Q: What sequence folds into this?
């Protein structure tokens, strides 16, 4: 058991399926304009979510965290960081890496896992 | 509409705000203090926490008139009540010990709807109520809207 | 200086710009059907490239590599692995993680960086 | 077209294949031995390497007739020649010491086009020629096509 690698794997799997379905609707003769349009938006947002998570993870790591994991997909942003010590200090420096429009619109949670 | 946003309490003078809504541009200290701490989880505060000087129970009441769309005991949050108002606006009261309403109840402004209590979620705010104002689902700073007409709320974003 | 974090950062930046331009063409009144169609394909392939790199990286890491970096974008797939010891053994076990249709169509290179 | 794929050498009997095209379904050992090693970089072999028993120089020649679309000295690869044939097919000869052609030359099958040499890229294949057959840019196993009519190549994928 290693929870990070399992999660990343399952997330990917899930994301893949997601893209495939979005693409499937967008590409389909039986979708309406509305439906194509919305599937298309969900598709491009997902990429941006993808980009947001990769960048956030990279940034945290640069702040001296050994590994980090970030899921920015829903109403909340979940961020899990490998670390033995955790504090209000440490958490707030991580939350500072997140975009304003995210923090304005969404909750953000940061969990520190024993390394 | 037509009414002003009220402190969600009956005896507003005997309580103080013990936690504020998280603001990204506040000093480090104020950001640190607007955090919800669970275990080794931190989360952003999406409202204010009110508690009485000696953390005694106190009655919570509807900040504005509306319809109770939610009223249930949550094992982490305590009781949670959510009141629907006009225009995708709505308010949330949570950490309650008791509830004096149920789903579908119409309440009026200042009508008591529950009692403060302690919580699993924010044990740090002791005996309190967590209060939130949301517009179409998104939480805004309560303090920004206190005593302002209903409209001053629906005129952000801009 | 840390070459991994710089690269991931620059890659992201670059990818972002990429998606934005693809999206811009697809969304534009002045693109032809052909152009929208091709921009759209480049867009969906990029996601799949994105997915391929994240998964590959996760897999390698599970094989006892401390960190790995994978760019699957072009004619070649570049994979850089943190490691002091390198061998034909080790490299071939990494190349085994890559999809058949990739290895069939593209070159694959694996570099081992001093950790 | 109409011709068979030839060993890219004049004296085919005095050389052997010292590295094979990488095949993903081969035993571990054969995959290991189909690797191009640079420094702490490994890359997949996209062709065969031919060398003479004692690694003496030998003349390389066009495996099929076509037009030389590329002929240049590369500081890592040695000389590299690429001959265009019919139907997005083309062949690549690389690690050459010398070249007997230039861009735009039409060559005929078995026409000498250069000399074997050593390389930075694969120092492990000593004095050799690296040879590749590509269809619309993608490298296929040379050994699969040796002595087969031109067509047996353009009938994969399937």
A:
């Amino acid at each position: 058991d290693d929870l990070f690698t399992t999660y990343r794997l399952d997330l990917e799997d899930a994301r893949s399926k997601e893209r495939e379905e979005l693409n499937a609707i967008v590409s389909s003769d039986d979708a309406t304009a509305k439906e194509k349009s919305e599937a298309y938006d969900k598709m491009t947002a997902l990429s941006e979510v993808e980009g947001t998570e990769k960048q956030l993870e990279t940034l945290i790591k640069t702040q001296g965290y050994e590994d980090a994991l970030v899921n920015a997909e829903g109403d909340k942003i979940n961020i899990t960081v490998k670390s033995d010590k955790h504090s209000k200090s440490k958490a707030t420096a991580i939350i500072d890496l997140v975009a304003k429009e995210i923090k304005t619109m969404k909750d953000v949670a940061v969990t520190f896992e024993p390394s | 509409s037509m009414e002003n946003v009220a402190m969600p309490v009956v005896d507003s003078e005997n309580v103080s705000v013990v936690k504020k809504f998280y603001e990204t541009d506040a000093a480090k200290e104020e950001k640190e203090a607007a955090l919800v701490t669970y275990n080794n989880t931190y989360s952003l505060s999406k409202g204010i926490d009110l508690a009485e000087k000696d953390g005694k129970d106190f009655d919570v009441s509807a900040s504005l008139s509306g319809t109770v769309v939610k009223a249930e005991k949550d094992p982490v949050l305590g009781y949670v009540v959510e009141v629907e108002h006009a225009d995708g606006l709505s308010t949330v009261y949570q950490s309650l010990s008791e509830v004096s309403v149920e789903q579908g109840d119409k309440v009026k402004q200042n009508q008591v709807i529950g009692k403060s209590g302690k919580n699993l979620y924010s044990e740090d705010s002791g005996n309190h109520v967590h209060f939130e104002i949301r517009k179409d689902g998104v939480a805004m700073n309560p303090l920004n809207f206190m005593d302002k007409p209903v409209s001053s709320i629906e005129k952000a974003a801009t």
